[PDB]
Amino acid sequence: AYQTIYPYTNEVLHTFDNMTDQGLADVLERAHLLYKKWRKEDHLEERKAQLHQVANILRRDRDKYAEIMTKDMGKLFTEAQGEVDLCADIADYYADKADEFLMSTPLETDSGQAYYLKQSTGVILAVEPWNFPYYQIMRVFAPNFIVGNPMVLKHASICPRSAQSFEELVLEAGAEAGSITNLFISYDQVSQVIADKRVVGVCLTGSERGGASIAEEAGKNLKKTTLELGGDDAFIILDDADWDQLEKVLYFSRLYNAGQVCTSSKRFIVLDKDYDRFKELLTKVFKTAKWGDPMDPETTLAPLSSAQAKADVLDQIKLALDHGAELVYGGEAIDHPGHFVMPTIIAGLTKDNPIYYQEIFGPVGEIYKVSSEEEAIEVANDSNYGLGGTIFSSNQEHAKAVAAKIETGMSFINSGWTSLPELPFGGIKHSGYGRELSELGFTSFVNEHLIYIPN
Amino acid sequence: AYQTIYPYTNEVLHTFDNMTDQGLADVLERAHLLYKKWRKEDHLEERKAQLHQVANILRRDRDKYAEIMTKDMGKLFTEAQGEVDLCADIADYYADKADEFLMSTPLETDSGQAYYLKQSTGVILAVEPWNFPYYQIMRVFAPNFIVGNPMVLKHASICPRSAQSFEELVLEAGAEAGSITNLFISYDQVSQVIADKRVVGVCLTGSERGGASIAEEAGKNLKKTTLELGGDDAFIILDDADWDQLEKVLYFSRLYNAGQVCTSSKRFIVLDKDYDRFKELLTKVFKTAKWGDPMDPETTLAPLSSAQAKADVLDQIKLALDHGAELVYGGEAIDHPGHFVMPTIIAGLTKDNPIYYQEIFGPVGEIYKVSSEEEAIEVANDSNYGLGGTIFSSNQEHAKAVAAKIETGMSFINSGWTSLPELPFGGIKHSGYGRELSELGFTSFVNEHLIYIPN
C-alpha cells in the first residue's frame, strides 16, 4: 500500500514494506522511554539546537527534499521548494520561542500564590495527508518536539519517501532516535497505537471519514485530539474590491497545488453587478495554466496526486453538471499520461445540487452569485465547513467587519490563504477543531500543571 | 429513571418523567436559534447582568438550594452551602472577566496585520455527576453562557431535583429560555444529541466508562470534547512537613463530602520515619467523625449518595483486605437505614492488589510507606490517574520542586484540594484532558477566528 507512484508518469518509483507488529511495539517503547528521559532530565537546549539544525539541513538540501515531494505526490518543484521554506521557518520559529512558550504562567488569586507549568504528556500520534508532505509534519512535529513529546507518524500511502526521509532528516539533525518515527502501518494498527497506554494524544489532518474513525477510537481510549479536516472556503468579492490586486492573486487562490489545498478558495462569491466580469476574469486566469512536467520551471499546473483523486474530481464535475450546474470553462479531458485535470469553472450551483455542499479537491473554480453583502455572508455560512475564507475589499475596516460575520476559523483579507508559524490554523464544523502553529498549537498536548499555595 | 431518593432515609421524594423525543428536538432547535441570535447580535451585556443575577439569587436562597443537594445526594447541609458559595463566586468571576476574556488577541508578525476573535461555536452538551450537583454545572455553564454557547445538560440520575432547579434558577435570573436546559434523557438520547449537527461540543465530568462511551460518540461525530474523570491523588508528606498544619487539614482532605471527591486525598504517601506516627494521627482524625442526619449541624460525616455507591465501596474494602491489604481502622458496618460507610483506613497495598490502582469514592484512607522522597514520587506516578495531589513540606521551594516531578494536572501545597474560578481544573491519563475554570476552560469551546491582512 505504501509506494511512490510519480503522478506525472504513473511510474512506480519505490515500494515500502509495512511495519510489523513487533516493530511497532519497539517504536512505542523507545518513544515512551525517550519521553520519560526528557521529563527527568533537562534536554530542552539540545532539542532547541537540534530543531535549528533541522532548519539548516532543509535550507541546505532544499532542492533534494523538494523533488522528493514532487515525485511522491507530483506538485510543482517550485511549489515544493516553497514548502520546504515554510518548514525551515516553522522549525526556527519554535526553536526560538521555546523558552517563552515553556515559561510557567502565573495566575492571579487573592487567596495565595498560583501558577501553572507547561509540561509534556507523552508520545503523540500524528496522522497526516499527502497534500503538503513536509509542512503537514513540521506543523505538529516542531512544537511537540520542543515540548518534549516524542512523536509517531502515520503519513499518507502515496507519499512514503517524504515520510521516511523526514525521519532521517530529524535523525541527521542530531535528534535522539524516537523523537519522530515514521510508521508504514495499516489503519488497523493505527487503532492499536491509539489504544496503547504509551500514546497520550492524536493529531490528525485529513478526510472527514478518517478524522471520524481516528477520533472515535481516540474517544474510546480517552485520548485528546485535534482535527484539521477539509474546507470549502468562500472568497467574497465586495463592492469596493481592488480588481487589479484581485487579478494578481486569483491564480494562486484556486490553482495553487492544483486546487488540492484545504484552504483553497473553493467558493467564489461575487455580486450581481460584478458577475459577468468575474466570470471573464477567472476564465482569463485559468487559460494561462500551463500543465506538464512538474519538474520543469515553465509548468504552472501540476497533475493531481493520484488516479483516484483525478477520478473523484472529474466525477464531481460530472455530478455538478448533471444536477443543474453550468459549465463556464474547461471540462474536456487532458489526454496525456499522468493524473491531469484541466482548470474548470462552474456556476449556477443551487442548494439542490449536491456539489454545492461538497469540497472539490481539484482545479475547479465555482462561482456563486449574490445581490448583497447579506446574501454573501449567508452563502458563505451555508456550509458544513468553516476552515478558511477570503474577503476582498479596498476598505480594510470594512473587510474586517464582514469577516467577523463569517462562521469559519480563518479569514484572509485581499489575498488567498497563507500559513505562517505565528498564525493559528484550524477551523470549525466539519473542518475540525483545535488549532495548529502559533502558541495555540503549541499547547494542544501540553499538560498545564497547576501549583497552588494557599495563604 | 431520574429520581430523588434521600440517602439518609432511602425514601423516594420525587420522580420525574423522562424527556420525550419531540421535546428533545424542540429544546435543541430553541438552543440553536438562541446561538444564532447571540452570534448575529451582541447580547454580552445582558448575559453578564443575568449571570450576576444568578449569583444574587443563589446568595439569597442559599439554604434553599443547599437543602436540595443534601436531599438529592446526601451531602452535609453545611458543605452544600459552601458549594453554593463557590457557585456564586464562579458566576461573578465570569460576569466580571467577561470583557477581558472575550477580548480580541493581537498576533505579532512582520508579514502583515493579524489577530483573532474569540467567538462562540454553538450548543454545548454538558454531562455532569452527582458529587457536586451545582458546582459541576456552574463550572461549565458560567464560562460558556458568557461566550455565547447555549447549553444542554444531562445530569446524574440521582440528583434530578438539583438539575431541574438549576434551569429554573437561570430562568429566574432573567436569562432567555434555552440558555441552559436540563435533559432527563436516556444514554440513548444522549447519543442522538451528540450526533445532532446543532451540538458542537461535549464537556463531560464523570466515570471512566461513561466518559469513554460519550467521547467515542463525540469522536465519531467530529465534536470537540473535554473530560474530567476520576482521580486517585497522592498526598505526599515530605521529611520537613509541619505536622501541626498536617493535622489541621487531614479531616478535610479525605472525609470531605465523604471522600466522594475526584480530588479527595486518596493515597497518603509517608516515609518510614513518619509511618507509625501517621497511622496514629490519621486514626485519631477519622475517629472524630460523627455520622447521622446530614441536615444536622453536628453531623460531620454524611451517608454516601446511593445504596450502590455504598455497596461498591464496601466491596472495594473487602477486596483490598482479601488481596493482602491491612485493616488499620474502622471497616465496621453501620446499622442505620442511611447509606453509611464508616471511615476506614487501610495500608499494605501492593501492586499485586487490585485496589492499589483503583479509585475509592468513599471514606477510605490508604497509607503507602516509602523509604525516600524519590520513592514517594515513583508511587505517586505509578497510577493510571493524574488529577490532583498534595505535597506537604515547610520548605516552599522544596514543595514546588517535588510537585513538578509529579505527573498530574494539579498540585496543592500544604493543603487539601481546592477549586476557585481563577484556577484551572483538570488532569491527565485516565483523569481526562482539557481544563475547566480560569481562562483556560473559558476557551474550550471558543472559535479562535484568525483575521489576516498581508502587507
Coordinates of N, CA, C and O in Angstrom, one line a residue, chain A residues 204-216 227-231 357-359 384-385 429-432, chain B residues 219-222:
Chain A
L204 N -4.7 14.7 13.9 CA -5.0 14.3 12.6 C -5.4 15.4 11.6 O -6.1 16.3 11.9
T205 N -4.8 15.3 10.4 CA -5.1 16.2 9.3 C -5.5 15.2 8.2 O -4.8 14.3 7.8
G206 N -6.7 15.5 7.6 CA -7.2 14.6 6.5 C -8.6 14.7 6.2 O -9.3 15.7 6.4
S207 N -9.1 13.6 5.6 CA -10.5 13.5 5.2 C -11.5 13.4 6.4 O -11.0 13.0 7.5
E208 N -12.7 13.6 6.1 CA -13.8 13.6 7.2 C -14.0 12.1 7.7 O -14.2 11.9 8.9
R209 N -13.9 11.1 6.8 CA -14.1 9.8 7.2 C -12.9 9.4 8.1 O -13.1 8.8 9.2
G210 N -11.7 9.7 7.7 CA -10.5 9.4 8.5 C -10.6 10.0 9.9 O -10.6 9.3 10.9
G211 N -10.8 11.3 9.9 CA -10.9 12.0 11.2 C -12.0 11.4 12.1 O -11.7 11.2 13.3
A212 N -13.1 10.9 11.5 CA -14.2 10.3 12.3 C -13.7 9.0 12.9 O -14.0 8.7 14.0
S213 N -13.0 8.2 12.1 CA -12.5 6.9 12.6 C -11.5 7.1 13.7 O -11.7 6.5 14.8
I214 N -10.5 7.9 13.4 CA -9.5 8.1 14.3 C -9.9 8.8 15.6 O -9.5 8.4 16.7
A215 N -10.8 9.8 15.5 CA -11.3 10.5 16.7 C -12.1 9.5 17.6 O -12.0 9.5 18.8
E216 N -13.0 8.7 16.9 CA -13.8 7.8 17.6 C -12.9 6.8 18.4 O -13.2 6.6 19.6
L227 N -8.5 18.0 15.3 CA -8.8 17.7 13.9 C -8.7 18.8 13.0 O -9.2 19.9 13.2
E228 N -7.9 18.6 11.9 CA -7.7 19.5 10.8 C -8.3 18.8 9.6 O -7.6 18.1 8.9
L229 N -9.6 19.1 9.3 CA -10.2 18.5 8.1 C -10.3 19.4 6.9 O -9.7 20.5 6.9
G230 N -11.1 19.1 5.9 CA -11.2 19.9 4.8 C -11.9 21.2 4.9 O -12.2 21.6 6.0
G231 N -12.0 21.9 3.8 CA -12.6 23.2 3.8 C -13.3 23.5 2.5 O -13.0 22.8 1.5
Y357 N -22.5 21.7 -1.7 CA -22.0 21.4 -0.3 C -20.8 20.6 -0.2 O -20.3 20.3 0.8
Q358 N -20.3 20.2 -1.4 CA -19.1 19.3 -1.4 C -17.8 20.0 -1.7 O -17.8 21.0 -2.5
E359 N -16.7 19.6 -1.1 CA -15.4 20.2 -1.3 C -14.8 19.5 -2.5 O -14.6 18.3 -2.5
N384 N -21.1 23.1 5.5 CA -20.7 22.1 6.5 C -19.3 22.3 7.0 O -18.8 21.7 7.9
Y385 N -18.6 23.2 6.2 CA -17.2 23.5 6.5 C -17.1 24.9 7.1 O -18.0 25.7 7.0
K429 N -16.9 23.3 12.7 CA -17.8 22.4 12.0 C -17.0 21.1 11.5 O -16.2 20.5 12.2
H430 N -17.4 20.7 10.2 CA -16.7 19.5 9.6 C -15.3 19.7 9.3 O -14.6 18.8 8.9
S431 N -14.8 21.0 9.4 CA -13.4 21.3 9.1 C -12.5 20.8 10.3 O -11.3 20.9 10.2
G432 N -13.2 20.4 11.4 CA -12.4 20.0 12.6 C -12.5 20.9 13.8 O -13.5 21.7 13.9
Chain B
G219 N -16.3 11.6 19.0 CA -15.3 11.5 18.0 C -15.9 11.0 16.7 O -15.5 11.5 15.6
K220 N -16.8 10.1 16.7 CA -17.4 9.6 15.5 C -18.1 10.7 14.8 O -18.2 10.7 13.6
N221 N -18.6 11.7 15.6 CA -19.3 12.8 15.0 C -18.5 14.1 14.9 O -19.1 15.2 14.6
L222 N -17.2 14.0 15.0 CA -16.3 15.1 14.9 C -16.6 16.3 15.8 O -16.6 17.4 15.4

